[PDB]
From a paper:
Photosystem II (PSII) produces dioxygen by extracting electrons and protons from water, which takes place at the oxygen-evolving complex (OEC), an oxo-bridged Mn4CaO5 cluster with a shape that resembles a distorted chair. In conjunction with the oxidation of the OEC, protons are released in a 1:0:1:2 stoichiometry for the S0–S1, S1–S2, S2–S3 and S3–(S4)–S0 transitions, and two water molecules are split to produce a dioxygen in the S3–(S4)–S0 transition, after which the OEC returns to its most reduced S0 state. Here we use pump-probe serial femtosecond crystallography to reveal the structural dynamics of PSII from nanoseconds to milliseconds after illumination with one flash (1F) or two flashes (2F). We identify structural changes associated with electron transfer, proton release and water delivery at various regions, including QA–QB, YZ, the OEC and the O1, O4 and Cl-1 channels.
The diminishing difference densities around QA and the non-haem iron at Δt1 = 1 µs to Δt1 = 200 µs suggest that the attraction between the non-haem iron and QA− is decreased and that the electron on QA− is transferred to the non-haem iron. At Δt1 = 1 µs and Δt1 = 30 µs, difference densities on D1-Q165, YZ and D1-H190 decrease, indicating that they have moved to their original locations. In addition, a strong negative difference density appears on W7, suggesting that W7 is disordered during this period. The trajectories of the YZ area at Δt1 = 1 µs and Δt1 = 30 µs correspond to the re-reduction and re-protonation of YZ• to YZ, which completes by Δt1 = 200 µs, consistent with the 55–85-µs half-life of YZ•+ re-reduction by the OEC in the S1–S2 transition. At Δt1 = 30 µs, paired negative and positive difference densities appear on two sides of Ca, indicating that Mn4 and Ca move outwards from the OEC, causing an increase in the Mn4–Ca distance from 3.83 Å at Δt1 = 200 ns to 3.96 Å at Δt1 = 30 µs. The results suggest that Mn4(III) of the OEC donates one electron to YZ• at Δt1 = 1 µs to Δt1 = 200 µs. At Δt1 = 30 μs to 5 ms, disorder of W10 and the concomitant movement of D1-D342 were observed, consistent with the previously solved structure of the S2 state25. At Δt1 = 30–200 μs, a negative difference density arises on W53′, which is located in the cavity surrounded by OEC-O1, D1-E189, D1-E329, D1-H332 and D1-D342, indicating that W53′ becomes further disordered. Movement of D1-D61 towards the OEC is also observed at Δt1 = 30 μs–5 ms. Subsequently, difference densities near Cl-1 decrease during the reduction of YZ• at Δt1 = 1 μs and Δt1 = 30 μs.
Residue numbers in the entry:
A (entry chain D): 11 to 352
B (entry chain V): 1 to 137
C (entry chain A): 11 to 344
D (entry chain C): 23 to 473
E (entry chain E): 4 to 84
F (entry chain F): 12 to 45
Write the structure that this text describes.
């Protein structure tokens, strides 16, 4: 049977400069539209009607301050389809209401699905194991938990991260002030995975580069390697003795070493995602009850935990009126928490 | 919203005469205020003495009144304490003390008017932000 | 074979289970001193007047702390950058009140860790290796210098050095944001690219090598038994790995030279963390992140807020609340 | 194309300047052309500064780093550091810029026209890195040049107009230095001071007599050592301790430059004598003390007894004791009580700040000086918005002390990395394994197992 | 190789540059004019510097209803005189 | 010898064509005054 399906399959899987595949039918339009929407919005589109913010090059923002901002809080969790009941097919209104945000987030989510399908598809054609796709589950878990689950637990898309450099910084600081997110052990595990992954990346790269066999005569050692050679290009034995004597322990199994390099950052990102799922419901690690009971009764008891909550309290009171304009917070000067003099 | 002649119309003196600045005057006042004054007066406050600001309501109750062009131009020639009782040229920049405040040496009478006009117009634009300090940033 | 040569040959011997070496002669006592003091202080030290205002902060477990809130508390703001060894105090009780232990721990630790870096160079020389592993370690080492020594020097006090604790670290980060807007500094941004990229390329390299392991085992056994320590032949097919990843992106975005691939794995996080360490070290002299507060103005002159101004609101809340009793004058100039 | 590709030389293009290691003639050209770049920048940057300079603004409000260096040497300034004559700044710039063409000329000639190697052309200018005698002779010549350079500063100070003295009675002025400190206990006592707070090692030098006398000692020492190294060759203990190669010698200098960059970073951050605050702006400690002074003065004028005002913590609101008893400014600036400055010392008594002087002797010029420094604290953003990180746009300011300290920390750090890179490589190349491990001779395979 | 013409071949060919010395500046100028004619403002609904606020108001025209949001924005746009 | 219009050709231009148009738009913005 060589019908139209099989002929299409032939054309999709041609060895070309940019491989396409069946996954490409999902991947390429969604990736292109998510990226083009971000570029279109950061260049031309305002956040005046949803946030009270300028957010485009057209308005005078720079690369750090442009964003595609979330919709107004009054949209709730609306899909904000261009043809939906809010914009009613009006492209200019759609832009003013935050439609580009759900546009980017939703095409981005399906683009990510398409990229992971691409990893499966190419792996199956070339004959390799699909561990690259498996590792890519971690960025997907992060994207889905932060950009979809988190706002879906909150009141509206408004509290999702906006797509911009400084907008994401605001998101970090909001999470400190409101959620005490540095205190969360699921974030801590994520920090461990990311920093441990960066550590492993540096240390493996340097160890290989400093246990190389002399396989050529030049002072540039890069040339003395051939992709099809059968020999290891560096000494696992010498590397093992170095770290055993420097650090006490060392890798001795090169397969374990490289699975571990997959394992550490992937696991950390997955742990951080779980904690953000909790924050969707405000299920925070905000306090230590034992600390609060002592400190309430004993005005001489002070720790770095209690010092940090006062910082959180400042963040909330000083940023909330501008950051949540739909709430109409009016905080007179006399209610604002402040230390002496400042 | 636009910088209109209404915005640029400020009291010239205490008797109720007004004067209408040009946009070029206002913008020149801003540049010269930044040059000579904003190190202590950024945003209409006073970093070395926060009890006294450049809000028009505060300038109105100074002695003599400073909420108009002539009062402000006089202040930059011969500044006084808030109650008028003492002359503070020795510690506040002025034409009288241009020898010890060298940035005042190249200000002309026309510059003093432009600086004065900036001080009187900015609160009409910024509202509470002018002289309000960090609470309004 | 005199006694000095014997001692020199033992010190530099490549047969010791842990290499000592000449750097190790400084490393071992200083690290032991710092470790012993840290453990004792973390468990049992009494509260410390970190900001010099007779307002002691409790850092140890026996005084009401858990693992997350506990710290060794930086030394008193009244001491500033003065040297405060035990023998400068009238008693141990004075030394403990003023945060003496913090100074003892970080000075011994920074010495010990600098010698740890020399020791990495030294052993590579004894084994006939190339010498640059210690250059990679200079990135985390420089970062330690930045938060324990350089930042206190520029601000004039070890009381603004990073605390030795988990929540103390968070306190340091939050106040740093308030006072320097580090999120808007391109060196911290390069640092984030360093560690986000390092974690990405770590998972990348690990998954690609794992994806192209040559079948040497049955399904009931760990594939790790397919590699034998010391074997001459490579354990995965880099051509198949390059063939997969080249098709994932495009052919010329993929490495087929393992040496330059591994050089890239070394360089990217190390260079990024150098920039992060330099960010902390230059904000120690108050060259702060980008300030776009009120940068966008309308035709009349109304301020139009951007996300930078929202960040500023959060920074203000951090600023006005930190060290709530320590400021008598309106500007927090250090 | 001698040694001008990777095949002939062994070095790829991105390490291309390593192809010069044994080509002394082209290497000479590279060094001379590069010195031309240094001299070019010095001349051009000065002219740019002068073109952009308004004499009525303080230097530190104008982004100047070179004119402050010239003014400190006593050219162009008078009492209080006021600019009286900008022509010296013009001369310094022009002469450096013109000289860079001479150096650029000789650099380009030796690099691409002259003999590639100098050993065949001249045994005086030729050298072998391994010739310990020749290398110490070249070193000796340059020590003599450096020693002469240090004596030129002494000559400027003692015979050609003097130096700007921020501490001069009457507000600061150019002063001829007639009795430089020569007592070696003073000069070398600076070298044995602790580098911690209240001591400050050599960064604490606080008077021009010590500065000038130190350069007399440094000049002699450099000239003597330069003669010593012309006439001698390294001793046996020295021969066994070092690696004798071009890359090794480079690495030692990289270590030395890194150390000097870190010292300069602190010098400009803390010292207000050879970096006068009139030209560079107040130090960080200085501006913080000046705020306390400003509000002590304001509040005392309103009728506060500042000696007895208890602050919210129980410590004095304005005044307190240091850990050794001295009367000092309160608030967070308690950390900066080691600061010394001409505008503050008249209030100092044997016990520290003197309450009678505070009540009676504060002069208007001190109030002016403290308010000026408080409002030019070395704080500012990367885009040069002056002030704390939370300040709004308005003031275009970053202190020269911040520009100079940050730039030289960054440079000193990377030069430390360069030292480690080249020292580790010089060691490996001398021993013969800088290209990797010999498979048939892998040292670990001949060692006993660890367990 | 995958059969397409090498990029280095293409971008050093005179024919490539004959074509793209026109198509590149033409696109650039079209982008410039999209802004300079003011058309970008009207396509996307972005305020000009003089249309963030009415002359005396200081309140944001914030959208506060889901299904009348379109009418709210149009009402805010009327109130700019 | 080689084709002109390939998949790679389309992918190059779907990216390159809007980029240039946007660079011109953003260049124009640098001359807008309030
Ligand atoms: C893994 C790999 C995945 C790969 C990526 C896949 C991407 C696919 C894209 C799917 C996007 C789904 C959009 C969901 C929108 C939504 O939910 O929109 C929410 C709506 C409900 O609307 C909300 O309802 C709320 C409650 O109102 C109710 O109560 C009110 C107050 O009393 C009033 O009475 C009101 O009339 C009444 O309706 C508020 O009105 C909100 O403003 C309004 O937004 O649900 C709905 O559309 C449907 C709700 C039922 C299905 C939910 C399952 C899917 C989501 C799971 C996430 C769990 C989140 C829980 C937190 C953890
Ligand atoms: C070969 C190597 C061998 C190593 C030897 C190890 C021995 C100890 C090493 C030094 C440790 C220094 C710690 C304290 C540094 C410091 O407080 O530095 C400050 C001092 C200056 O001291 C200050 O000096 C001041 C002097 O000013 C005084 O005098 C002035 C006169 O004009 C003014 O009047 C001023 O107001 C007045 O106070 C005051 O005394 C201050 O209180 C005092 O703090 O700097 C100085 O001494 C000079 C600068 C020292 C270098 C700074 C260290 C930087 C290290 C970077 C490492 C990076 C590594 C990366 C790893 C990868
Ligand atoms: C200060 C920076 C500096 C200096 C002084 C040098 C100097 C040198 N390099 Mg190095 N190099 C540098 C940076 C520098 N390089 C950088 C950044 C890289 C990375 C790209 C390299 C990579 C590199 C490689 C791969 C090689 C060199 C080589 C050389 C040497 C011969 C160059 C030659 O033959 O060119 C010939 C070039 C020309 C004839 C074209 C113009 C050259 C002139 C000098 C331009 C000067 C213009 C100037 C305005 C004129 C002023 C005139 C006026 C004063 C009268 C020379 C000593 C070569 C070498 O080692 O040979 C053994 C060599 O192979 N360099
Ligand atoms: C006086 C200082 C000095 C001197 C004479 C040398 C000399 C040498 N170095 Mg060393 N090096 C130094 C300091 C120095 N280095 C420092 C401070 C570092 C730490 C960063 C290094 C790190 C280093 C490494 C890692 C290597 C060398 C190597 C070499 C050799 C080849 C150099 C070359 O051709 O580069 C060619 C020049 C380039 C390719 C250009 C680099 C471009 C830089 C990164 C731009 C920096 C940005 C700029 C400051 C600002 C932005 C500009 C932009 C806006 C336009 C040569 C002997 C190589 C070697 O080992 O050979 C034996 C080598 O692999 N060096
Ligand atoms: C000692 C070095 C030094 C210092 C402390 C200063 C300081 C200053 N300069 Mg000067 N200048 C310098 C060198 C220096 N400059 C050089 C080399 C040039 C020629 C390019 C100039 C030409 C110059 C001009 C034309 C002007 C100044 C101006 C100024 C003032 C404002 C600076 C500013 O806004 O920067 C902005 C900050 C940056 C651009 C940050 C640069 C970030 C770099 C690229 C990072 C590099 C990191 C490292 C070196 C690379 C490592 C790579 C790694 C892989 C190893 C400030 C006083 C201005 C002024 O006010 O004049 C009165 C002004 O108009 N300078
Ligand atoms: C330190 C840098 C330096 C060094 C070591 C050399 C060394 C050499 N040069 Mg080169 N050259 C240089 C810089 C240098 N030159 C400069 C700056 C220029 C442009 C002027 C030249 C232009 C040049 C040419 C055109 C030629 C040489 C030649 C030579 C060779 C023979 C020189 C001789 O015998 O003169 C004998 C010594 C003297 C005549 C004494 C000169 C005294 C000077 C001019 C007065 C100033 C002295 C004082 C210390 C200067 C302080 C400068 C400081 C402030 C910067 C010798 C290898 C020749 C060559 O390569 O043969 C093939 C040759 O033809 N040079
Ligand atoms: C650029 C300057 C320079 C350089 C590179 C050299 C280089 C050299 N000198 Mg020369 N020397 C110089 C200037 C210089 N000298 C000057 C100006 C003088 C006159 C005072 C001398 C007088 C001199 C004598 C008498 C001798 C040398 C010798 C040597 C050789 C051995 C150096 C050595 O082992 O140091 C290593 C340093 C030490 C062993 C010092 C002790 C180690 C201490 C504990 C380190 C302390 C470090 C600490 C961080 C210090 C911080 C600052 C401190 C002051 C507080 C080496 C070739 C030796 C030689 O072989 O002559 C032929 C020798 O006998 N030099
Ligand atoms: C710090 C060194 C200052 C500079 C520079 C400028 N001003 Fe100032 N100003 C300063 C102080 C400490 C005070 C209070 C003086 C007092 O004790 O009464 C003032 C006051 C004013 C006022 C009066 C405000 C009022 O009465 O409400 C005005 C109008 C004023 N200053 C204007 C002004 C101008 C125009 C400046 C640049 C030419 C300028 N100041 C600089 C501190 C400092
Ligand atoms: C949304 C939407 C859509 C779409 C659209 C699109 C698709 C677009 C695209 C667009 C695009 C596609 C754009 C682009 C742009 C680009 C740009 C704007 C760029 C720039 C660049 C630059 C600026 C660069 C820079 C740099 C760097 C980064 C580094 C290197 C160096 C340099 C500096 C060069 C549709 C219609 C469907 C529908 C509706 C909605
Ligand atoms: C070798 C080499 C190199 C390098 C080179 C160099 C580095 C060079 C240098 C050069 C130089 C270093 C040059 C210089 C020149 C200069 C000049 C030419 C000048 C002139 C001047 C003038 C003409 C002046 C004028 C004036 C006056 C007098 C007055 C005022 C005004 C004015 C300014 C106008 C490279 C890397 C490329 C590569 C290849 C090899
Ligand atoms: C000018 C002046 C002055 C003076 C000064 C002086 C007098 C100085 C001196 C200085 C000096 C006099 C210095 C010294 C230095 C030294 C060093 C820096 C050393 C080093 C060493 C080393 C590095 C070694 C090493 C080693 C070892 C240890 C072992 C074996 C091997 C080797 C060799 C490697 C004063 C301050 C008064 C004032 C101001 C001005
Ligand atoms: C959705 C795709 C389902 C395949 S459908 C399948 O396609 C063949 C082409 O090979 C035809 O010959 C056949 O009649 C048809 O049923
Ligand atoms: Cl204070």
């Amino acid at each position: 049977e060589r019908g139209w399906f099989d002929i299409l399959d032939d054309w999709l899987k041609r060895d070309r400069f940019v491989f396409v595949g069946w996954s490409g039918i999902l991947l390429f339009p969604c990736a292109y539209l998510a990226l083009g929407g971000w570029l279109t919005g950061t260049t031309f589109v305002t956040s005046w009607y949803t946030h009270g913010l300028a957010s485009s090059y057209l308005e005078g923002c720079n690369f750090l301050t442009v964003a595609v901002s979330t919709p107004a809080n009054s949209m709730g969790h609306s899909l904000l389809l261009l043809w939906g009941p809010e914009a009613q097919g009006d492209f200019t209104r759609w832009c003013q209401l935050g439609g580009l945000w759900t546009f980017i987030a939703l095409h981005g989510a399906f683009g990510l699905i398409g990229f992971m399908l691409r990893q499966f598809e190419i792996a199956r054609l070339v004959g390799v194991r699909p561990y690259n796709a498996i590792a890519f589950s971690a960025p997907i878990a992060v994207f889905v938990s932060v950009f979809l689950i988190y706002p879906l637990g909150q009141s509206s898309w408004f509290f999702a991260p906006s797509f911009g450099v400084a907008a994401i910084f605001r998101f970090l600081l909001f999470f400190q002030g409101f959620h005490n997110w540095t205190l969360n052990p699921f974030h801590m595990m994520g920090v461990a995975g990311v920093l441990g992954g960066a550590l492993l990346c540096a240390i493996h790269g340097a160890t290989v580069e400093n246990t190389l066999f002399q396989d050529g005569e030049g002072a540039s050692t890069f040339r003395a390697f051939n992709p099809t050679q059968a020999e290891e290009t560096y000494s696992m034995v010498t590397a093992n003795r170095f770290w055993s004597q420097i650090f006490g322990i060392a890798f001795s199994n090169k397969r374990w070493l490289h699975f571990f390099m997959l394992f550490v950052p992937v696991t950390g990102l997955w742990m951080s995602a779980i904690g953000v799922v909790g924050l969707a419901l405000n299920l925070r690690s905000y306090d230590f009850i034992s600390q609060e009971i002592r400190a309430a009764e004993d005005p001489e008891f002070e720790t770095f935990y209690t010092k940090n909550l006062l910082l959180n309290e400042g963040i909330r009171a000083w940023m909330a009126p501008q950051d949540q304009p739909h709430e109409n917070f009016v905080f007179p000067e006399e209610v604002l928490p402040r230390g002496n003099a400042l | 919203a636009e910088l209109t002649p209404e915005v640029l119309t400020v009291p010239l003196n205490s008797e109720g005469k007004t004067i209408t600045l040009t946009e070029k005057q206002y913008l020149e006042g801003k540049r010269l205020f930044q040059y000579a004054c904003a190190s202590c007066h950024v945003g209409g406050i006073t970093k070395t003495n926060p009890s006294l600001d450049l809000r028009t309501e505060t300038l109105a109750l100074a002695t003599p009144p400073r909420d108009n062009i002539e009062g402000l131009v006089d202040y930059m020639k011969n500044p006084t304490t808030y109650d008028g009782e003492q002359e503070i040229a020795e510690v506040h920049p002025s034409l009288r003390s241009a020898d010890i405040f060298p940035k005042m040496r190249n200000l002309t009478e026309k510059d003093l008017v432009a600086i004065a006009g900036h001080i009187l117009v900015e609160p009409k634009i910024l509202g509470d932000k002018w002289g309000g300090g960090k609470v309004y940033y | 074979a005199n006694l000095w040569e014997r001692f020199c040959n033992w010190v530099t011997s490549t047969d010791n289970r842990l290499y000592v070496g000449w750097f190790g002669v400084i490393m071992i006592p200083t690290l032991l001193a710092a470790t012993i003091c840290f453990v004792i202080a973390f468990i049992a030290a009494p509260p410390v007047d970190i900001d010099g205002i007779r307002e002691p902060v409790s850092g140890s477990l026996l005084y009401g702390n858990n693992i997350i809130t506990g710290a060794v508390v930086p030394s008193s703001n009244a001491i500033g950058l003065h040297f405060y060894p035990i023998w400068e105090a009238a008693s141990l009780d004075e030394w403990l009140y003023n945060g003496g232990p913090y100074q003892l721990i970080i000075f011994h630790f920074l010495l010990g860790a600098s010698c740890y870096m020399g020791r990495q160079w030294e052993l590579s020389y004894r084994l006939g290796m190339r010498p640059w592993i210690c250059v990679a370690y200079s990135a985390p080492l420089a970062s330690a210098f930045a938060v324990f020594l350089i930042y206190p020097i520029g601000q004039g006090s070890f009381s603004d050095g990073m605390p030795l604790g988990i929540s103390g670290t968070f306190n340091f980060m939050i106040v740093f944001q308030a006072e320097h807007n580090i999120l808007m500094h391109p060196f911290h941004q390069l640092g984030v690219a360093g560690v986000f990229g390092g974690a990405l390329f770590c998972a990348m390299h690990g998954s690609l090598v794992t994806s192209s392991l040559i079948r040497e085992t049955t399904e009931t056994e760990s594939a790790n038994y397919g590699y034998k320590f010391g074997q001459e032949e490579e354990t995965y097919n880099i051509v198949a790995a390059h063939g997969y990843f080249g098709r994932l992106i495009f052919q010329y975005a993929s490495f087929n030279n393992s040496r330059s691939l591994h050089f890239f794995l070394a360089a990217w996080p190390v260079v990024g963390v150098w920039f992060a360490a330099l960010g902390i070290s230059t904000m120690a002299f108050n060259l702060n992140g980008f300030n776009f507060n009120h940068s966008v103005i309308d035709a009349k002159g109304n301020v139009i807020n951007t996300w930078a101004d929202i960040i500023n609101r959060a920074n203000l809340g951090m600023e006005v609340m930190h060290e709530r009793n320590a400021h008598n004058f309106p500007l927090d100039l250090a | 194309a001698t040694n001008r590709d990777q095949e002939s030389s062994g070095f790829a293009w991105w390490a291309g300047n390593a192809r010069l290691i044994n080509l002394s003639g082209k290497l000479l050209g590279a060094h001379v052309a590069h010195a031309g770049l240094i001299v070019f920048w010095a001349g051009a940057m000065t002219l740019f500064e002068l073109a952009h300079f308004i004499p009525e603004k303080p230097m530190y409000e104008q982004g100047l780093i070179l004119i402050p260096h010239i003014a400190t040497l006593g050219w162009g300034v008078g009492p209080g550091g006021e600019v009286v004559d900008t022509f010296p700044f013009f001369v310094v710039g022009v002469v450096h810029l013109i000289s860079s063409a001479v150096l650029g000329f000789g650099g380009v000639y030796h690099a691409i026209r002259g003999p590639e190697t100098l050993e065949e052309y001249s045994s005086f200018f030729g050298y072998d890195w391994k010739d310990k005698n020749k290398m110490t002779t070249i070193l000796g010549f340059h020590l003599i040049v450096l020693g002469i350079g240090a004596l030129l500063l002494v000559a400027k100070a003692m015979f050609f107009g003097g130096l700007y003295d921020t501490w001069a009675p009457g507000g600061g002025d150019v002063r001829v230095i007639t009795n430089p400190t020569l007592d070696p206990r003073v000069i070398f006592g600076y070298l044995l001071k602790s580098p911690f707070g209240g001591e400050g090692w050599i960064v604490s030098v606080n008077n021009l007599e010590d500065v000038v006398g130190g350069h007399i000692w440094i000049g002699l020492i450099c000239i003597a050592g330069g003669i010593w190294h012309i006439l001698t060759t390294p001793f046996g203990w020295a021969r066994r301790a070092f690696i004798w190669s071009g890359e090794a010698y480079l690495s030692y200098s990289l270590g030395a430059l890194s150390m000097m960059g870190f010292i300069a970073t602190c010098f400009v951050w803390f010292n207000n004598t050879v970096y006068p605050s009139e030209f560079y702006g107040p130090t960080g400690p200085e501006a913080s003390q000046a705020q306390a002074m400003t509000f002590l003065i304001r509040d005392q004028k309103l009728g506060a007894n500042v000696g007895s005002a208890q602050g919210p913590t129980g410590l004095g609101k304005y005044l307190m004791r240091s850990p050794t008893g001295e009367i000092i400014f309160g608030g967070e600036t308690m950390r900066f009580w080691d600061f010394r400055g001409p505008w503050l010392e008249p209030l100092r008594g044997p016990n520290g700040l003197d309450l009678n002087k505070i009540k009676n002797d504060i002069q208007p010029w001190q109030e002016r000086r403290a308010a000026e420094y408080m409002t030019h604290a070395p704080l500012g953003s990367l885009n040069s918005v002056g002030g704390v990180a939370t300040e709004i746009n308005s003031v275009n300011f970053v202190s020269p002390r911040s520009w100079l300290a940050t730039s030289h920390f960054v440079l000193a750090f990377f030069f430390l990395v360069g030292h480690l890179w080249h020292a580790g490589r010089a060691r490996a190349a001398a021993a013969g394994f800088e290209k990797g491990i010999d498979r048939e001779s892998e040292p670990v395979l001949s060692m006993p197992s660890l367990d | 190789t995958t059969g397409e013409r090498p990029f280095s071949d293409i971008i050093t060919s005179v024919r490539y540059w004959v074509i793209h010395s026109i198509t590149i500046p033409a696109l650039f100028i079209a982008g410039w004019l999209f802004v300079s004619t003011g058309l970008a403002y009207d396509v996307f609904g972005t305020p000009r510097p003089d249309s963030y606020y009415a002359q005396e108001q200081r309140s944001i025209p914030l959208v506060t209803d889901r299904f009348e949001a379109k009418q709210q924005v149009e009402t805010f746009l009327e109130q700019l005189k | 010898s080689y084709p002109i219009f390939t998949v790679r050709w389309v992918a190059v231009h779907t990216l390159a064509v809007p980029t240039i148009f946007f660079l011109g738009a953003i260049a124009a913005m640098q001359f807008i005054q309030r």
